[PDB]
């Protein structure tokens, strides 16, 4: 009557569409998670920046006055 | 070439299309499993670790805020 | 003061309950996705089984 493979391809493609939709939803959720984490951690680069600035500042001061003593 | 074999070749194309579709489905399902079961939990673990970071150093944060009005 | 402490214990246990139920829902959702994938790939077997019912079925006849 009808080509046997037609229904097979129909079902296979339908399932492919379904799981690709699942993939899209999963990656969208992942993107939301990453955005949340970045916004939350936006304090950490501030922390790191001021810490690095303090380190450079104390090193420069130990250069300006010669209190920098030999290593151990 | 042959007529019986040319109908055979049409059927070959049908078989190859089916098996390629099956392989594609398997690959996409593996990708979905990798995303859902591995990548997202590790992202969540990294989130928890970074939260513990910012929690442990909050005493420095509050000092710097008290004098810098940041 | 005691009522406040009661309330804060409530909030603590409720938030941990919320996160645990989150975990439960996510696990069940993943399991359901996998199961429905199994069903989707399996549904085609009914037709071939029905075709092979013509050779041997046993109790039915």
């Amino acid at each position: 009557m009808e080509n046997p493979h037609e229904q097979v391809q129909a079902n296979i493609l339908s399932r492919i569409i379904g799981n690709v939709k699942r993939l899209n939803e999963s990656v969208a959720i992942l993107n939301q998670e990453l955005v949340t984490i970045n916004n939350r951690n936006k304090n950490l680069e501030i922390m790191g920046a001021i810490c690095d600035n303090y380190h450079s500042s104390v090193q420069f001061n130990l250069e300006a006055t010669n209190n920098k003593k030999p290593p151990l | 070439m042959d007529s019986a074999s040319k109908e055979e070749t049409l059927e070959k194309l049908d078989q190859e299309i089916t098996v390629n579709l099956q392989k594609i489905d398997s690959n996409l399902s593996f990708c979905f499993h990798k995303i859902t079961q591995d990548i997202i939990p590790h992202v969540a673990t990294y989130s928890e670790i970074c939260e513990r970071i910012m929690d442990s150093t909050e005493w420095l944060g509050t000092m710097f805020q008290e004098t810098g009005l940041v | 003061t005691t009522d406040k402490y009661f309330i804060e214990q409530r909030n603590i246990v409720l938030q941990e309950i919320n996160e645990t139920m989150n975990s439960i829902l996510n696990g069940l959702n993943g399991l359901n996705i996998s199961l429905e994938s199994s069903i989707a790939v399996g549904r085609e077997f009914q037709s071939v089984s029905d075709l092979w019912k013509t050779l041997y079925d046993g109790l039915e006849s």
């Binding site: 939709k21 939803e25 959720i29 998670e33 | - | 919320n18 989150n22 996510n26 959702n29 359901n32 429905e36």
Partner: peptide, 11 residues
């Protein structure tokens, strides 16, 4: 009637 990946988070 097909479940969709919906990771719940927070409250």
């Amino acid at each position: 009637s097909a479940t969709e990946y919906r990771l719940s988070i927070g409250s």
